[PDB]
Swiss-Prot record, chains A, B, C, D, E, F:
Modification after translation: O-linked glycans are assumed to be the Glc-Gal disaccharides typically found as secondary modifications of hydroxylated lysines in collagen-like domains.
Disease: C1q deficiency 1: An autosomal recessive disorder caused by impaired activation of the complement classical pathway. It generally leads to severe immune complex disease characterized by recurrent skin lesions, chronic infections, an increased risk of systemic lupus erythematosus, and glomerulonephritis.
Top-rank lineage group of the source organism: Eukaryota
Domain notes: The C1q domain is the ligand-recognition domain, which specifically recognizes and binds the Fc regions of IgG or IgM immunoglobulins. The collagen-like domain interacts with C1R and C1S proenzymes.
Gene name of the record: C1QA
Transmembrane feature ranges: none
Residues carrying 5-hydroxylysine: 6, 21
Assembly and binders: Core component of the complement C1 complex, a calcium-dependent complex composed of 1 molecule of the C1Q subcomplex, 2 molecules of C1R and 2 molecules of C1S. The C1Q subcomplex is composed 18 subunits: 3 chains of C1QA, C1QB, and C1QC trimerize to form 6 collagen-like triple helices connected to six globular ligand-recognition modules (C1q domain). Interacts with CR1 (via Sushi 24 and Sushi 25 domains). Interacts (via C-terminus) with CD33; this interaction activates CD33 inhibitory motifs. (Microbial infection) Interacts with Staphylococcus aureus protein Cna; this interaction results in the inhibition of the classical complement pathway.
Function: Core component of the complement C1 complex, a multiprotein complex that initiates the classical pathway of the complement system, a cascade of proteins that leads to phagocytosis and breakdown of pathogens and signaling that strengthens the adaptive immune system.
Range of the intact protein held here: 28 to 53 of 245
Originating species: Homo sapiens (Human)
Residue positions, PTM 4-hydroxyproline: 12, 18
Sites carrying sugar chains: 6, 21
Swiss-Prot record, chains G, H, I, J, K, L:
Organism superkingdom: Eukaryota
Whole-protein coverage range: 34 to 58 of 245
Organism encoding this protein: Homo sapiens
UniProt protein name: Complement C1q subcomponent subunit C
Function text: Core component of the complement C1 complex, a multiprotein complex that initiates the classical pathway of the complement system, a cascade of proteins that leads to phagocytosis and breakdown of pathogens and signaling that strengthens the adaptive immune system.
UniProt domain comment: The C1q domain is the ligand-recognition domain, which specifically recognizes and binds the Fc regions of IgG or IgM immunoglobulins. The collagen-like domain interacts with C1R and C1S proenzymes.
Record's disease association: C1q deficiency 3: An autosomal recessive disorder caused by impaired activation of the complement classical pathway. It generally leads to severe immune complex disease characterized by recurrent skin lesions, chronic infections, an increased risk of systemic lupus erythematosus, and glomerulonephritis.
Localization (cell): Secreted; Cell surface
Quaternary structure and interacting proteins, as annotated: Core component of the complement C1 complex, a calcium-dependent complex composed of 1 molecule of the C1Q subcomplex, 2 molecules of C1R and 2 molecules of C1S. The C1Q subcomplex is composed 18 subunits: 3 chains of C1QA, C1QB, and C1QC trimerize to form 6 collagen-like triple helices connected to six globular ligand-recognition modules (C1q domain).
Positions where 4-hydroxyproline occurs in the chain: 3, 6, 9, 12, 21
Modifications after synthesis and translation: O-linked glycans consist of Glc-Gal disaccharides bound to the oxygen atom of post-translationally added hydroxyl groups.
Curated annotation (Swiss-Prot), chains M, N, O, P, Q, R:
Domain free text: The C1q domain is the ligand-recognition domain, which specifically recognizes and binds the Fc regions of IgG or IgM immunoglobulins.
Cell compartment(s), UniProt: Secreted; Cell surface
Assembly notes: Core component of the complement C1 complex, a calcium-dependent complex composed of 1 molecule of the C1Q subcomplex, 2 molecules of C1R and 2 molecules of C1S. The C1Q subcomplex is composed 18 subunits: 3 chains of C1QA, C1QB, and C1QC trimerize to form 6 collagen-like triple helices connected to six globular ligand-recognition modules (C1q domain).
Organism: Homo sapiens
4-hydroxyproline modifications at: 2, 5, 8, 20, 23
Source lineage: Eukaryota, Metazoa, Chordata, Craniata, Vertebrata
Main function: Core component of the complement C1 complex, a multiprotein complex that initiates the classical pathway of the complement system, a cascade of proteins that leads to phagocytosis and breakdown of pathogens and signaling that strengthens the adaptive immune system.
Residues of the full protein shown: 34 to 57 of 253
The protein's name in its UniProt record: Complement C1q subcomponent subunit B
Free-text description of this protein's post-translational modifications in UniProt: Hydroxylated on lysine and proline residues. Hydroxylated lysine residues can be glycosylated. Human C1Q contains up to 68.3 hydroxylysine-galactosylglucose residues and up to 2.5 hydroxylysine-galactose per molecule. Total percentage hydroxylysine residues glycosylated is 86.4%.
Disease: C1q deficiency 2: An autosomal recessive disorder caused by impaired activation of the complement classical pathway. It generally leads to severe immune complex disease characterized by recurrent skin lesions, chronic infections, an increased risk of systemic lupus erythematosus, and glomerulonephritis.
Source species, domain of life: Eukaryota
Amino acid sequence: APDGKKGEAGRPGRRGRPGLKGQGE
Amino acid sequence: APDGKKGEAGRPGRRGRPGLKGQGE
Amino acid sequence: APDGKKGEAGRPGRRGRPGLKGQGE
Amino acid sequence: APDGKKGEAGRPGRRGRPGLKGQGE
Amino acid sequence: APDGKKGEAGRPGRRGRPGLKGQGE
Amino acid sequence: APDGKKGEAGRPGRRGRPGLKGQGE
Amino acid sequence: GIPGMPGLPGAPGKDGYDGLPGPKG
Amino acid sequence: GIPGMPGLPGAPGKDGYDGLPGPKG
Amino acid sequence: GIPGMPGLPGAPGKDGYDGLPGPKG
Amino acid sequence: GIPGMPGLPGAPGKDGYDGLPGPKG
Amino acid sequence: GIPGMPGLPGAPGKDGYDGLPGPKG
Amino acid sequence: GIPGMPGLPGAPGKDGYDGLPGPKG
Amino acid sequence: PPAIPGIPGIPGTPGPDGQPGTPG
Amino acid sequence: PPAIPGIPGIPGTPGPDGQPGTPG
Amino acid sequence: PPAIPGIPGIPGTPGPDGQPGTPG
Amino acid sequence: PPAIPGIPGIPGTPGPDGQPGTPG
Amino acid sequence: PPAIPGIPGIPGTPGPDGQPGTPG
Amino acid sequence: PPAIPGIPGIPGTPGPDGQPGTPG
């Protein structure tokens, strides 16, 4: 029986961007 | 006859964002 | 012959946003 | 009868970003 | 033989936006 | 046997944008 | 007996656009 | 014997929008 | 009797781009 | 002999969000 | 007589990126 | 004679991210 | 009798634009 | 007996808006 | 007689650019 | 014997948020 | 004779970058 | 003999990050 190929699951989202400095005092 | 299910139509886009204040006089 | 339904063509992109004022002299 | 697998419904959108401070008086 | 229609290839991305002026000296 | 065509794998994402200058001292 | 085939969901709508910001008050 | 056909996954939801920034405190 | 197969919808168009901002008045 | 049918790939994940910027140091 | 099956359209291309802004003149 | 069935294209890759901007020179 | 298939749904309409800004 | 196919899932709901800003 | 299938639609055209800014 | 088809994969999880900013 | 199916199209190329800024 | 179908392609890898900024 020539069975059907499995698909591949989506890849996880990357990290969010990291915050920068607050005020310049 | 085991007939095929209907699909569902896409949902309408939300409102656009509302403008903020102009100049600070 | 129960023929197949035609699809519908994509909708045209909206206008681009219009530019705002240049410098405040 | 080797019946067909059900699909999985999409996941809900995350929260919107929360507003930051207004004017610096 | 009622053969199957060919699809159409995607359209090329437009130009990137062109840079504006550097510093106001 | 009129066998089925292979698909083509997605194309790699382009580079990220490169950072610009830090503070103007 | 041969079954019917189901359809897929419609794509959700693109959101509205930002209203331009207020004039002189 | 003829098998059933599986469905595909639903599209994940568009995220919420940014809450407007605070008023005078 | 064997039924026909329906097509899917076309993708909606990418919007236009921002017009550049005004010159000296 | 009738062949099996293959599946398609999963959609890649939406990325994380920007961490808020630092407080007074 | 059994008909052929049609293909779907290709995805339109991602646009180019913004050219960096001008140097000192 | 029964034909084979073709596959579809892979999704193009998400681009890289912006490198952080330069330190004090 | 042998069955008949379903039809696909269409994309939703694109939202209306937001309300324009305030004064003062 | 010959089998019956499955049905596709639907898109998830769009998230609620974020909380509005602070004072002072 | 056995039926014939339908054909898919194409993507819509990308919008024209916005109008350029004002003076003064 | 006549064959059986495959199943599709699922979308990947959405990434965790970035680390919050620095001081000074 | 029984028919043969069609083939799918490919994604379009990604656009070239924009022109770099002016002087003065 | 009756034919066998094809397999679908996979999504391309996500690009590497851009180079970090300059000094002076």
